[PDB]
Amino acid sequence: EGIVAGITPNIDALELNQDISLAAVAASTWGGAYGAHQPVEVIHSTYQAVHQSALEENYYNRLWLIPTAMELGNVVSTQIRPASVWNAYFSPRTLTAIDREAADGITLSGQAS
């Protein structure tokens, strides 16, 4: 009937500030499409296979990294900048840790571990 379309290399590696889009469904196969009823429709079901996809699954289901390169330039006073991350997973993505290297003097206030 229908099993898989693919599109695993494209979307996962595409120009997406997210990744692993529509990945959980791959293992979650299930399937009960086969079968037709007669609500006096006409009943014309042919082939019923898989093909292509939205092709625009962009920016779905993981963290974000808005800042890519910071131009601090000359630092002479206490500066404050925002850092944000957006998780689109239906389940949280817990950060393992923040290995601070040469980052002494940089602190985050109002946030837990």
Automatic annotation (TrEMBL):
<protein>
    <recommendedName>
        <fullName>Virion structural protein</fullName>
    </recommendedName>
</protein>
